Amino acid sequence: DDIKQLAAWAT
Amino acid sequence: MEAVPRMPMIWLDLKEAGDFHFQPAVKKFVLKNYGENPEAYNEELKKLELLRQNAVRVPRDFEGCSVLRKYLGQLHYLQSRVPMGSGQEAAVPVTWTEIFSGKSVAHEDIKYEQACILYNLGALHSMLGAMDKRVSEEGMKVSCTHFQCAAGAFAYLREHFPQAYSVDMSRQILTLNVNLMLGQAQECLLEKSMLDNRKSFLVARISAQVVDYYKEACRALENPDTASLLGRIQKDWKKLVQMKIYYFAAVAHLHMGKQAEEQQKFGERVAYFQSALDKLNEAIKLAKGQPDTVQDALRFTMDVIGGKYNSAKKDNDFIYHEAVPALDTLQPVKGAPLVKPLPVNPTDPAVTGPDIFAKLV
């Protein structure tokens, strides 16, 4: 959730 | 912690290029092995020469990264049509300056030229990542991506060029660069997670990974052989990295205390805040003589941690009356790696454009 948003932000 | 002052970032210098007289070798090979008039390739040689000149004097902006990738791909295309590797027919001397010695290093190997271009790709990415102020989500995002690109370039160099042409591109040194670049990318991501006020436990894990990356880089800097090679550079890098280890350990334990607060564990909250304060105090000692950028971030974080610790101890002493667990009672936070070395694809047609020597049979 929080991770998926942050993971996509970092790509 | 949404507006904590931004820590400075480490970047690597670009390598300086010497001669690479590929024109006589290509013309000789074209006549001998392809049976064609070498003068029919003057336009193609002009293009590659103009591309190399642009790449070796690369503009230090975003478009400069595209020039380096484009030139890198064209070198792969040339090598597939004209053998210029080690011991091969059309090989000519390639010369670049080694970073730590400042001395010229020559190899009769086109893959040495490829290696240096890929080093400078990672170096330029580190420069652009470190240039931004990270006070905007656009500049924070661009900086995080730049540091990941830098890790990927050095990582690609480490894997596909295990023959260290010079010591600045050796395995141990590139490993240090990769870990350092990943720590700075994770640090940029941490600033984003604290801007969004994400869940406290995730921020702790994200900050704990910053610590892990910097700990890996600090181990390499403490290696005597790496320290003797880097010289003064190891002193300057290790000073910033060692302080950041304690700085982001404090940030990690600050948010572990916030989780303890959310979980109504008010004695555990004191333990994590006191740990965060101790770690931050050690970072303050380690930051003696460092620029105001470092002092301004420590001072801001001190206002937060120092106040939260005093308030938590006051709450526990006079309201909650719960047991404060020791330091060594607490499960260490597991880092959450949410960055990665972004891959390098040398022969991606979208980054190289058409093969310059496409007509060479």
Residue numbers in the entry:
A (entry chain E): 4 to 14
B (entry chain A): 1 to 361
Please quote the authors directly.
His domain protein tyrosine phosphatase (HD-PTP/PTPN23) is a tumor suppressor that regulates mitogenic receptor downregulation, endocytic recycling, and cell migration (Chen et al., 2012, Doyotte et al., 2008, Kharitidi et al., 2015, Lee et al., 2007, Ma et al., 2015, Manteghi et al., 2016). A central feature of HD-PTP function is the ability of its Bro1 domain to recruit CHMP4, the major subunit of the ESCRT-III membrane remodeling protein complex (Doyotte et al., 2008, Ichioka et al., 2007, Parkinson et al., 2015).
Next, peptides designed from the C-terminal 18–20 residues of CHMP4A, CHMP4B, and CHMP4C were evaluated for binding to HD-PTPBro1. Interestingly, CHMP4 peptides showed much lower affinity to HD-PTPBro1 compared with the SARA/endofin peptides, with KD values of 132 ± 7 μM for CHMP4A, 85 ± 2 μM for CHMP4B, and 89 ± 1 μM for CHMP4C. The main CHMP4 anchoring residues are a Leu and a Trp present in all three isoforms (L217 and W220 in CHMP4A and CHMP4B, L228/W231 in CHMP4C), which contact HD-PTPBro1 residues L189, L202, and I206 from two hydrophobic pockets between H5 and H6 and H6 and H7. The mode of binding of CHMP4 peptides to HD-PTPBro1 is similar to that reported for the complexes of CHMP4 peptides with Alix or Brox Bro1 domains (McCullough et al., 2008, Mu et al., 2012). Thus, binding of CHMP4A/B/C to HD-PTPBro1 requires rearrangement of these side chains to accommodate the critical CHMP4 Leu and Trp residues.
